[PDB]
From a paper:
Here we describe a systematic approach to generating modular and rigid repeat protein oligomers with coincident C2 to C8 and superhelical symmetry axes that can be readily extended by repeat propagation. Repeat proteins are composed of an asymmetric structural motif that is concatenated several times in tandem within a single protein chain. All multiplexes follow the naming convention CsHRN_Rr where s is the cyclic symmetry, HR stands for helical repeat, R is the number of repeats in a single chain and N is an index to differentiate between multiplexes of the same symmetry.
C2HR1_4r has a large repetitive interface composed primarily of leucines.
Residue numbers in the entry: 2 to 140
């Protein structure tokens, strides 16, 4: 069962992040209702936040918000935060940006990702890409 295997990796990561076991149980229960694409993408986002040294309680809170999104939203968010890390955006800023993106609808997120990619292709400076993304989010 590939879903169960992926769920066990998530449970292991949450334990290594000192997430309260009571919260792990409630999270695991919610994850068991998602499809395998959502579960795998959520695993990746956890791995990325862990790589950025995001505080465990913040990872837990962010995960709980992401569990309510569909595969398309979760995937596009992963790509955005991967690009922001590549551009050396401070993890504290990536965290705050991710919290804002979660409330946006899928069309806006897809448009933002395209915009970031367009600007990268145009050789725009990392700080300019961050500032423009932050401005488009506030809009």
């Amino acid at each position: 069962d590939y879903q169960e295997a992926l769920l066990e990796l998530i449970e292991r990561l949450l334990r290594k992040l000192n997430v309260d076991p009571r919260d792990i149980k409630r999270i695991e229960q919610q994850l068991r209702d998602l499809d395998i694409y959502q579960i795998a993408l959520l695993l990746l986002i956890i791995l990325l936040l862990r790589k950025l040294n995001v505080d465990p309680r913040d990872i837990k809170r962010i995960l709980q918000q992401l569990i309510d999104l569909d595969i398309y939203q979760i995937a596009l968010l992963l790509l955005i935060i991967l690009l922001l890390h590549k551009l050396n955006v401070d993890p504290r800023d990536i965290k705050r940006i991710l919290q804002q993106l979660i409330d946006l609808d899928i069309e806006q997120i897809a448009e933002l990702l395209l915009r970031i990619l367009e600007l990268r292709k145009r050789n725009e400076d990392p700080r300019d890409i961050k500032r423009e993304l932050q401005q488009l989010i506030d809009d």
